[PDB]
């Protein structure tokens with residue numbers, strides 16, 4: 001019997017990346033004083049970008 | 050709950066930087 005389709009499963013998405021705050025910051029950093037943080041242990045939803 | 054952190058802590062004997070992860074159970 002041949003496999004009739006392919007099924008793919010993973011846990012639910014959770015804990016999105018802080019990009020959602022970064023690109024909504026009205027206080028966005030001046031280039032003479034640029035600022036950063038490590039996005040880690042997160043769902044990097046780059047498809048939304 | 051169980052609390053977990055990974056900083057460069059200055060607390061050589063008791064608390065009573067570099068915090069690249071945190072978690073709570």
Ligand SMILES: *[C@@H]1O[C@H](CO)[C@@H](O[C@@H]2O[C@H](CO)[C@@H](O[C@@H]3O[C@H](CO)[C@@H](O)[C@H](O)[C@@H]3O)[C@H](O)[C@H]2NC(C)=O)[C@H](O)[C@H]1NC(C)=O
Pocket residue numbers: 019020021023024048
């Ligand atoms: C920065 O914040 C904005 C605003 O929250 C984020 O983008 C926008 O997010 C809203 C939901 O909060 C989206 O609205 C929904 O869109 C669907 C699909 O068209 C529609 O059916 C719903 O009724 C509702 O309008 C919106 O599409 C989305 N995009 C834009 C351009 O407004 C944004 O994701 C945050 N920045 C980052 C990098 O995450």
Ligand SMILES: *[C@@H]1O[C@H](CO)[C@@H](O)[C@H](O)[C@H]1NC(C)=O
Pocket residue numbers: 066067068069
């Ligand atoms: C840890 O802190 C020191 C002093 O602030 C800094 O030089 C170093 O680059 C930091 N490293 C990380 C991974 O945060």
